[PDB]
């Protein structure tokens, strides 16, 4: 019925507009970053908000506005809350930090980055749908890097390929 | 005629209507698909299935079935279906 | 009127009938004992998950069955459904995978585990209570391996100091 949020995922200053269904990877990759020629200089923007949906897979994330999500009569809006509780707490105690801290903070900070980024490659193809499409594609089940094979799902076969076709070809090619 | 018997019962599902047949031997579903590919209850083809052990056949043979499907084709040892059930 | 929550399902084991609760705890178990020691089947089995609660850091995953989470109108069982079907789909499939897929899931079920392994795992204090306990013990801010910097949690400063006294002390040679 309505979306549902499950984790914010990161936290950004973009083009007014740069929320909603045309902010994914696979948009942006088939169409193009909304958010594109954007320094924070040049151009006023907004806060937006990384959102990991309840249900769909981390291929899904979208960049939303508090705006969009209340407009959008979502679920989870509690999230929202403590999701900005806990950056103010951890904005507090590192404004008093050795420059070693802010070394830390930055390094690790970019890892997590790099790890959640990768959520969204497949690692493996695994099944396919009897049925196909008007457009003659199955649906694929994918595993994705660094989630367990209990983050599988089926993914939409035409919309695989675009970027993973070498992975659709593996799989078939694992039969003969 | 020529009957088919039912060895075990391997397993018990909700599967999309029609998931059955010979369309759910593993080298089918390995070379077309599956017919209950990705079915949540939200859809509504409900409905319930046995992976069946058939006799004189390897296990890579077993099926998906219905009791609708068992009885049209009069296969032999529905005793155990139900059996199955209580 | 408080009941806990499921947040996230990290693990089914067949287990000693009863090696479920907060004697389940890593920071238990160290402790005391692991109540699902030297388990086989001689023993009753049963079907144990390990809940990650919503509220408290990763070290406090406890396993669970179906019953003691109902028992304790746990919230969030829709979410237990979800995973026992996603558990069985992916048995199945173990029925007849090739070696090689049955090779990369082992790969890449071990490697998970880890990262798991370490979210309980602290990289580093940020910072304490004003307020000691009864014992001169603060709480402490903690950052968590694997983890970003938006799970940090507040925690016993006693039960950290138990197993990562080293990080407390870097903490403190800095301020
Ligand atoms: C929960 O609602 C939905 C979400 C869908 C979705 N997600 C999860 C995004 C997140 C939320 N969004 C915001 C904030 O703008 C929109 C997009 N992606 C997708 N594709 C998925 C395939 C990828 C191939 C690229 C092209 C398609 C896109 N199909 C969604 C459908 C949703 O149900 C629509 C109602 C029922 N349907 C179901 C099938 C189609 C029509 C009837
Ligand atoms: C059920 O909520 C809780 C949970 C607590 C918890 N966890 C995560 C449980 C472990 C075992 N579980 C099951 C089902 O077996 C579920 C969760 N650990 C801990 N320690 C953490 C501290 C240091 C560690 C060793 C000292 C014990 C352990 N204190 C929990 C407390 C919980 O509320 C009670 C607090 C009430 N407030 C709110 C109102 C105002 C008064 C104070
Ligand atoms: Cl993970
Ligand atoms: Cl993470």
Redo the contacts between chains.
Sequence with gaps: EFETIER?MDCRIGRKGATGATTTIYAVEADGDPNAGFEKNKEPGEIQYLIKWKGWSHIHNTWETEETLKQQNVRGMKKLDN?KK??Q??KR??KN??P??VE??NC??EL?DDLHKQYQIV??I??????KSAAGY??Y?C?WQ?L???E?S?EDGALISKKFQACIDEYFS??K
């Design positions: 914010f999701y806990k950056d707490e951890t105690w590192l930090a050795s070693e801290d830390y903070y690790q900070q997590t690692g493996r695994i099944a396919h749908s009897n049925q199955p649906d089940y595993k660094g367990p094979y209990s599988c089926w694992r039969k």
